[PDB]
């Protein structure tokens, strides 16, 4: 049996499998709250950032 698609891949920076990487690419995570850390919000841009 071939389990290389679901076993973790050490080449990635985060140890996730190929199918896990596919699911993480399929979901577009738009709710990144504390990734901004308010510095990028303090730098005000003319584009309407939600």
């Amino acid at each position: 049996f071939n389990f290389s698609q679901i076993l973790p891949d050490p080449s990635k920076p985060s140890k996730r499998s190929f199918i896990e990487d596919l699911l993480f690419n399929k979901v577009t995570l738009a709710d990144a709250g504390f990734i901004k850390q308010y510095g990028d919000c303090l730098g005000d841009i003319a584009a309407r950032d939600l």
């Binding site: 308010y38 303090l42 005000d44 003319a46 309407r48």
Partner: protein
């Protein structure tokens, strides 16, 4: 109040965001556009035994 690159129309004075608050103003003496940003804030948590 910060300097901004907003291209105001000559008849426009104030700018409004999605929530209909004032976001950009025009300085009445020298014709310059200023962005208004709320001051720094955040949550405070206490970790204690």
């Amino acid at each position: 109040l910060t300097e901004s690159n907003k291209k105001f129309l000559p008849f426009q004075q104030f700018g409004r965001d999605i929530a209909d608050t004032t976001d950009a103003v025009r300085d009445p003496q020298t014709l310059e556009i200023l962005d208004i940003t709320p001051c720094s804030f955040g949550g405070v948590s206490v970790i204690t035994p």
